[PDB]
Amino acid sequence: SMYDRHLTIFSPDGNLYQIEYAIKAVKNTNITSVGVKGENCAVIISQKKMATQYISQDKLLDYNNITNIYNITDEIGCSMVGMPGDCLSMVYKARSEASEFLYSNGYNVNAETLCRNICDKIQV
Amino acid sequence: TLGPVVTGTSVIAIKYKHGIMIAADRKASYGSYAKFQNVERIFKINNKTVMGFSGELADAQYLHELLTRKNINNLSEKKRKEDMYTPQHYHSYVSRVFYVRKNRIDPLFNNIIIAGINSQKYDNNDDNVLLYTNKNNNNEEYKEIHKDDLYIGFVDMHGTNFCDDYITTGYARYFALTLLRDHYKDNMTEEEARILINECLRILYFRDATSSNFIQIVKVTSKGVEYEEPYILPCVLNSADYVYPSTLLPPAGCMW
């Protein structure tokens, strides 16, 4: 139909163009994060840069507050790139998922399972 | 009495090669409050008979009075050592008192142990009885007493009564009795009997809230009834897991 690129429904070729446009929206922020694994450690590096959005960067902006790295728990952190409202929302979703896991099971969720549970949320 | 108020916990009595060894901690509790910590709970009836009790202290003192005067009258009529009442006689008397009080719904709130030597052939103590002097406190040796000549009886609130080679009351009926049914044997020496009784009392100290580790041991042998010097039982925990700090365990989950 005329709205196959408006909703999350298949187009004639089988694509869900809304997913592609959300990914492009992530790409439009112009923020770069890099994660690297060691033998006994792991690192994330991101730009302390405001995502390119409607508003611009003022010289009265507190640049120390600008960040894209968050703690999910004491032992799990992340970089969230994309729309800042959505990134904060995903941070809170991940924090609540980790806390629920801990209470239900009596031990901290590891990063893999937290990522998979988040992605199960996104699939909805 | 309508129910227990001040109570002693548990008594253990066993036959060994020289007579009876009976033990009880010297504790009487006011509920969960350990008000009295130096209470005598094993009483001498005569030179061959002792009484131990668990349960209410006032009822136990009443029964002790009854038996004290019964032994006095026994001595008043005695003409020869054979006339003295045996432990079996006192056990029958106590079982009867309890039965009569049950029928009135007026029981003494006690479990009782009556133990002693059921023979007069092993010594001549009852030839000249001293009620108010003790000569054991001379350099003679104990005579081995055949188990059949020893008596350990039990009476509970409903009048249930029986005899055995070892009798327990209170929590000893679970903790001590298990080890006794597994490990007691005939003709034990004083050392082995004491070791077994001490193991039972240690378990009781670790598992019975009303118990203490200040133990009174009493012996009934050819030398008569002897009160040993009360002693503190050394009880150490049997695992380092108990002493491990909680902070060294994982902080998450139900770790306690």
Residue B50 counted as domain residue:
yes
Q: What are phi and psi of B41, to 5 degrees?
A: -125, -5
Distance between B248 CA and the closest CA of chain A, angstroms: 15
Residue B12 counted as domain residue:
yes
Task: Tally A–B CB contacts below 8 A.
Answer: 9
Which chain A residue lies closest to B255 (C-alpha atoms)? Answer: A106
Residue B10 counted as domain residue:
yes
Compute chain A's Rg from CA coordinates: 17
Q: Are B22 and B12 in contact (CB under 8 A)?
A: yes
Please tell me the distance from the alpha carbon of residue A2 to that of residue A4, in angstroms, as a whole number: 6
> What's the helix, strand, coil split of chain A in %, to 5?
40, 15, 50
Q: CB atoms < 10 A from the CB of B113, how many?
A: 25
Containing structural domain, residue B49: 5-232
The β-bridge relationship of strands B49-56 and B110-117 is antiparallel
Which chain A residue lies closest to B253 (C-alpha atoms)? Answer: A106
Verify whether the Cβ–Cβ distance A107 to B254 is below 8 Å.
no
Residue B250 counted as domain residue:
no
Residue B245 counted as domain residue:
no
Residues near B131 by Cβ (< 8 Å), separated by ≥ 6?
B72, B75
Residue from A99, A108, A109 whose CB has the most chain B CBs within 10 Å, to mutate: A108
Residue B16 counted as domain residue:
yes
Distance between B256 CA and the closest CA of chain A, angstroms: 12
From residue B167, how far is each of B114, B186, B230, B245 by CA, in Å?
9, 14, 21, 40
Task: Return the active site residues of B.
Answer: 1
Angle at B212 between CA B159 and CA B242, to 5 degrees: 120
Residue B216 counted as domain residue:
yes
Q: Tell me how many domains chain B contains.
A: 1
Chain B residue numbers with beta carbons less than 8 Å from the beta carbon of A102 are: 252
Burial class (CB in 10 A: 0-12, 13-18, 19+), B153: buried
Residues near B232 by Cβ (< 8 Å), separated by ≥ 6?
B213, B214, B215
- Positive or negative, the Cα torsion across A70, A73, A75, A78? negative
A83-92 long-range Cβ contacts below 8 angstroms, 24+ apart: A83/A25, A83/A26, A83/A29, A83/A51, A83/A53, A84/A51, A84/A53, A90/A118
- The amino acid occupying position A48 is K
Verify whether the Cβ–Cβ distance A108 to B252 is below 8 Å.
yes
Q: Are B21 and B182 in contact (CB under 8 A)?
A: no
Tokens representing residue A24 in the block: 């492009």
The alpha carbon of A62 is separated from its chain's Cα centroid by a whole number of angstroms, namely: 22
Is residue A102 less than 8 Å (CB to CB) from chain B?
A: yes
Q: Are B219 and B23 in contact (CB under 8 A)?
A: no
Residues near B29 by Cβ (< 8 Å), separated by ≥ 6?
B6, B7, B8, B9, B35, B36, B210
Q: Are B24 and B172 in contact (CB under 8 A)?
A: no
Residue B251 counted as domain residue:
no
Please tell me the distance from the alpha carbon of residue A122 to that of residue B69, in angstroms, as a whole number: 90
Query: In CATH, what number is assigned to the domain containing residue B185?
Result: 3.60.20.10
Interface of B with A in 234-253 (CB under 8 A): 250, 252-253
Is residue B256 less than 8 Å (CB to CB) from chain A?
A: no
Distance between B178 CA and the closest CA of chain A, angstroms: 38
Resolution stated for this PDB structure, in Å? 2.2
Elucidation method: cryo-EM
